[PDB]
Amino acid sequence: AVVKCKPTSPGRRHVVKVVNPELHKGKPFAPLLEKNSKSGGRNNNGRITTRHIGGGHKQAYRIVDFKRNKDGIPAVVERLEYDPNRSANIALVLYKDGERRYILAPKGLKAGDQIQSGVDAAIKPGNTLPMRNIPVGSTVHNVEMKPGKGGQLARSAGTYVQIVARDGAYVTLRLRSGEMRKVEADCRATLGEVGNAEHMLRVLGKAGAARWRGVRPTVRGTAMNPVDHPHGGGEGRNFGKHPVTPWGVQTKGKKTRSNKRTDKFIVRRRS
Amino acid sequence: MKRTFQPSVLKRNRSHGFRARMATKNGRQVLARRRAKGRARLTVSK
RNA sequence: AGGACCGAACCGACUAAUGUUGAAAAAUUAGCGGAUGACUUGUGGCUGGGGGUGAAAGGCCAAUCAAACCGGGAGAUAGCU
RNA sequence: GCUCGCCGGAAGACCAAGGGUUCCUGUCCAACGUUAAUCGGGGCAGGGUGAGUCGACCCCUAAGGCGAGGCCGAAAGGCGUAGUCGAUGGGAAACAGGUUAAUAUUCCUGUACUUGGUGUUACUGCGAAGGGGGGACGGAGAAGGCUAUGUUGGCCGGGCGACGGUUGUCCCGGUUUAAGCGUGUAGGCUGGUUUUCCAGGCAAAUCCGGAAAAUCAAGGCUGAGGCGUGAUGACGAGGCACUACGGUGCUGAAGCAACAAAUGCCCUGCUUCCAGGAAAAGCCUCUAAGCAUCAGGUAACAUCAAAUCGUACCCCAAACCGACACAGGUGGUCAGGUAGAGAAUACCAAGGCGCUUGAGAGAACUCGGGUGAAGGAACUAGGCAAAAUGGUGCCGUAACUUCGGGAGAAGGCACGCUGAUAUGUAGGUGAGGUCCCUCGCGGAUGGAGCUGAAAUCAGUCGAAGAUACCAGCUGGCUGCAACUGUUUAUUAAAAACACAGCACUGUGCAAACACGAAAGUGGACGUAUACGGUGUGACGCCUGCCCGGUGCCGGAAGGUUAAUU
RNA sequence: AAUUCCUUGUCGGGUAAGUUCCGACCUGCACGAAUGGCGUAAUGAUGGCCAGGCUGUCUCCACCCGAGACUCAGUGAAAUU
RNA sequence: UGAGCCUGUUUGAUGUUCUAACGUUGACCCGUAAUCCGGGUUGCGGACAGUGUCUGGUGGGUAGUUUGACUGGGGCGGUCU
């Protein structure tokens, strides 16, 4: 649910939280954890390459299954969990042969549910099929771009995709950005849409909240000197020039896509 | 008040040591110049 | 519960006096701000000069910065004293 | 040698980093020491550092470095696989007493402990570069059991007081004992055993994982403390005889209880929250190639080994960083008494010091302080500076408001000592005795002894009872920024920067973008509820007209236009 | 008015007397709506103004307690010419 | 379907199909005890993408430089044959 905090302190007045009384209160599955170290935006040359990154809380990595290629053996959901590396929850599933794995959580999935994969699975949420075997007009998530590679589309919280048509050996899809695209019909997808649709109703309420997640302050270019930015200078508050990036290119309208190898798979750009 | 020099043997040796100088091409030029001049002490190695 | 409240250790530097061939090439005395957090501290590591880092003051890079130190071109040029 | 003064959460005690003979003894006063010097961290000579258990070396890894082949670059060189290094982190084992001028968990005395090799006996399925377990991990809060430690009694030894009293309800001192071995408590967690089957753990598995039956309900792991032994020992005021004044040899009393009590231990525990909290080896288990008379493994004895390097001294300072015997800087551990909420503050204990020029006199003026008649900001750019308020408990408290606040708003009243309630009250702790018991570090009842607030009534002293150190001044009207934060080391701390919130725009993943002649890397082990750039700056009511100029987005009919032919 | 030169504009309140402060008027030399407009409880070592208590800031200075300055013995500089 | 040439000859333009150069930061096997590298098999693209020489456009991101004299001081004004 979504809950407001009471104004007992100036830093609690404008905080809205998301609370789910269904996630595990305990430790995650250990055989599926790895190490994850921070960078600060530096590369192998030691130079800052992406700005405004640094600090935060220690995190461990969960190995999640995006391929879903263990066919013919049903599974059961055990518990939902928390993952600090993404914006969606995950689920721990047990197979009839005695194996466990991690997957993304669809909407409407609770403990004790059955899931299956293959070319002969039922059409219900949580199942994985090739798009050759899914009706036109369905809603799917975690869609592949090449056969056998792994899900790459619609992986955030509350996202989905539609199958709009089919011809030959290709399928046509609509993306959350308003774009139409072609992918091979042997690619895989999972039924339903991702969960945690209320992740966008939270208000942090103070700067410490942003610091906790690893975000450093942003400095405006009009508050600098003319040797640090194309915007700096002036005796007061003066702009008198067209906005540009810190490296001279014009923001606010100019386009930056140039890839001729892929243009055959776009049917209409986002509107 | 705090001053500039703060000693540390490990850092001294890892920075200006004989093996550090030998590890690259220009440290060997430094050694050649000092040998040509005829110095009694060649590096900070004690 | 809290980037909550009064206040020592710890981190700072708003006011006055002394000092200015000083006890000190930035300090002392009496008052002053924060003090569970965007907090503070020990050891090691990475970023090199038209380059680095900067919650942005032309700030900092070994008492030196509107372009560091050292050795070379070099006995640069000086219608000037 | 006697008196006086200062510190005592340090100006006491022990270390890491750094320094390297500054340590003890004999001798000397040229230079050094801001003065003299018989003195010194000064000159000269000799002496002093003793380890299977303390560190280092050693086995294992983190950030990161190097890197056979490899990829890339005019040369020089760059980035990386298999590997190899790198602590601030993980991995076996010792306590008490005595001793020198200088060392002590190392030397002596007494009692312990751990890891390897060889040999003899008894039984037996052993074997990894592989699978599984464990090592193994966050912030805040709370209260129960203990110890370190202190106070008062009892016991032992000594005293009967320089000036009134002191044979007593009087004064002084002591009352200490470890590691190891045995018992397994306060408490924490977890159902136990047996049989069958299986698309999983790159091959196998008696191990891990999943499924099905029957039986029993109590089995297992963890754990401070207390108690016994160590100990017929050691220590201990005092006394017995010699003194080069440093000691020698012997003897040696008592050596108990109650109360109070930690920021230390049980605790890597329990409860709760979101920002969701390292790796590998040592250790325990399972098998493959292979050996099966052998090799190996398990247990009890005898025996050998545990090498090499550091060990003196200073360490909030005269020995380290500041050119100085410099009012500055520097990480960890120890934590007594009275008053007190307290690691604040005042006086003391153990311990350590009086800071390396002195002696007189008591002018103007400078520095740091105390008191002041009448007036009370008239001073000054400005209440700058100085003066003033200051504790606990209880009455009582406005406009405005985002309903939390404003608020400790403002303004008042009590406060010492003695006696009674009560020869010590309410509460806390808790022995002897009596019962039960699956017999023990047990359960029920009982109240001796110790400790001990707060309140009411009645008397009494001073000018003053929160008497010393310590310890908010309060109110009214207005500009700016919403708030906590950050900034010009060394003349500017702010209305400047950041901030949670809002909007425009780019980006379909070999993403936009950035560091790189390139290989590659970050963005990200992320996927439009995600990521980059730009402007505004909580919240409330709002954000009107102009596309002529300069940018950006779309169109392609016409006009002009490069190399090439 | 952090914006208004003429300017101490004109009217009202506070003072015996107010170029600063508070409330209004409109003649905006030269305000104005995300290089945002108008409000706003709480917070500020932020700028301006008014009161109570307090006082050596002042009329107007007087006395006392310590460290120098003065004399005696020892050691023994500096800028400048 | 545009030029020669008589349905025959060779070069152009637009378009649909193909595989063998070329790409693969798709899947499996080996060197091997390996998320680099190389080879093998197989899907998807495909004469497109990308690179070398030449050539038109944009380019304060970066670099080297210029911006006159007389004058009752310099600047503004005026002048320079």
Swiss-Prot record, chain A:
| Region span, Disordered | 27-52, 220-271
Q: Which Gene Ontology MF annotations are present?
A: RNA binding; rRNA binding; structural constituent of ribosome; transferase activity; zinc ion binding
What is the primary gene name for this protein? Answer: rplB
Further facts: This protein can be partially replaced in vivo by its H.marismortui (HmaL2) or human (L8, from the 60S cytoplasmic ribosome) homolog.
Q: Report the protein name in the record.
A: Large ribosomal subunit protein uL2
User: Which residue windows does the record flag with biased composition (Low complexity)?
Assistant: 38-47
In terms of Pfam families, this protein maps to: Ribosomal_L2, Ribosomal_L2_C
Q: Which GO terms describe its biological process?
A: cytoplasmic translation; negative regulation of DNA-templated DNA replication initiation; ribosomal large subunit assembly
Record HAMAP family: Ribosomal_uL2_B
Organism lineage reads as: Bacteria, Pseudomonadati, Pseudomonadota, Gammaproteobacteria, Enterobacterales
On subunit structure and binding partners, the annotation says: Part of the 50S ribosomal subunit. Forms a bridge to the 30S subunit in the 70S ribosome, contacting the 16S rRNA. Interacts weakly with S6 in one of the 3.5 A resolved structures. In pull-down experiments interacts with CedA.
What is this protein's function? One of the primary rRNA binding proteins. Located near the base of the L1 stalk, it is probably also mobile. Required for association of the 30S and 50S subunits to form the 70S ribosome, for tRNA binding and peptide bond formation. It has been suggested to have peptidyltransferase activity; this is highly controversial. In the E.coli 70S ribosome in the initiation state it has been modeled to make several contacts with the 16S rRNA (forming bridge B7b, PubMed:12809609); these contacts are broken in the model with bound EF-G.
SMART domains associated with the record:
Ribosomal_L2 (SM01383), Ribosomal_L2_C (SM01382)
Give the UniProt entry's GO cellular component terms.
Answer: cytoplasm; cytosol; cytosolic large ribosomal subunit; DnaA-L2 complex
Family to which the UniProt record says this protein belongs: Belongs to the universal ribosomal protein uL2 family.
UniProtKB/Swiss-Prot annotation, chain B:
Assigned GO CC terms: cytoplasm; cytosolic large ribosomal subunit
Tell me the superkingdom of the source.
Bacteria
Q: Keyword Chloroplast on this protein? A: no
Tell me which PROSITE patterns the record gives: RIBOSOMAL_L34 (PS00784)
Key words, A-Z: Ribonucleoprotein, Ribosomal protein
Q: Which GO terms describe its biological process?
A: cytoplasmic translation
Pfam families found in the cross-reference section? Ribosomal_L34 (PF00468)
Q: Does this entry carry the keyword Ribonucleoprotein?
A: yes
Output the Gene Ontology terms for molecular function.
structural constituent of ribosome
The UniProt subunit note reads as follows: Part of the 50S ribosomal subunit.
Q: Which family, according to the similarity comment?
A: Belongs to the bacterial ribosomal protein bL34 family.
Protein name according to UniProt = Large ribosomal subunit protein bL34
| Originating gene | rpmH
